Amino acid sequence: KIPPRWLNCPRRGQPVAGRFLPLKTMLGPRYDSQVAEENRFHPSMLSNYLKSLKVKMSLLVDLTNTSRFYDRNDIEKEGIKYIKLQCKGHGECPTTENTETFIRLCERFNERSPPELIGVHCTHGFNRTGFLICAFLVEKMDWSIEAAVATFAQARPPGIYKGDYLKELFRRYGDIEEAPPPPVLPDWCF
Numbered sequence: 724k725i726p727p728r729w730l731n732c733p734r735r736g737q738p739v740a741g742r743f744l745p746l747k748t749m750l751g752p753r754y755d756s757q758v759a760e761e762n763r764f765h766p767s768m769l770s771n772y773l774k775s776l777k778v779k780m781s782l783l784v785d786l787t788n789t790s791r792f793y794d795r796n797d798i799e800k801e802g803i804k805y806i807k808l809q810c811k812g813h814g815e816c817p818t819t820e821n822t823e824t825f826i827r828l829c830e831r832f833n834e835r836s837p838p839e840l841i842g843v844h845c846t847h848g849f850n851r852t853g854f855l856i857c858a859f860l861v862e863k864m865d866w867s868i869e870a871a872v873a874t875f876a877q878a879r880p881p882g883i884y885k886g887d888y889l890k891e892l893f894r895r896y897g898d899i900e901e902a903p904p905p906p907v908l909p910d911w912c913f
């Protein structure tokens with residue numbers, strides 16, 4: 724069955740720090756009977772959009788822990804590197820090991836010229852996706868965690884919305900006492 728709350732979720736956010744493109748998961752043609760034409764998001768739709776802007780994606784990081792949504796070959800056949808990065812389950816935020824894995828991978832690709840984007844997606848494109856992007860911005864790009872979280876909230880509204888995720892990012896990179904409460908969600912979520 725298609726994931727819950729996916730149909731109304733925007734396919735992509737704005738790019739973050741000129742490098743990361745946050746996305747919800749694509750769903751291949753296997754789900755066409757459950758998804759109306761206007762709401763589809765096959766992998767081809769992402770690559771055709773990038774081609775239309777003369778933009779290349781160097782790497783797509785899939786944080787879903789499943790291969791049931793789309794065919795990784797639809798990404799790889801276009802010359803985009805595909806990585807399935809398994810993250811801590813049970814609703815917990817990504818571990819320090821997961822974040823190191825993500826940073827080790829993305830640092831091999833973030834400095835290409837000409838510039839290319841790194842796509843990042845979980846099922847919906849907000850919590851695991853925003854957590855790992857923020858961790859990279861702080862650890863490798865020297866942004867403050869306040870700036871990272873606020874930029875991700877404006878690029879992919881409403882941003883990270885699990886309060887435990889926000890608190891863990893501030894415990895790791897700032898002052899846990901200053902972590903913001905989760906945002907109030909928009910009506911489309913439910």
Ligand SMILES: [Mg+2]
Binds near residue numbers: 752
């Ligand atoms: Mg096909």
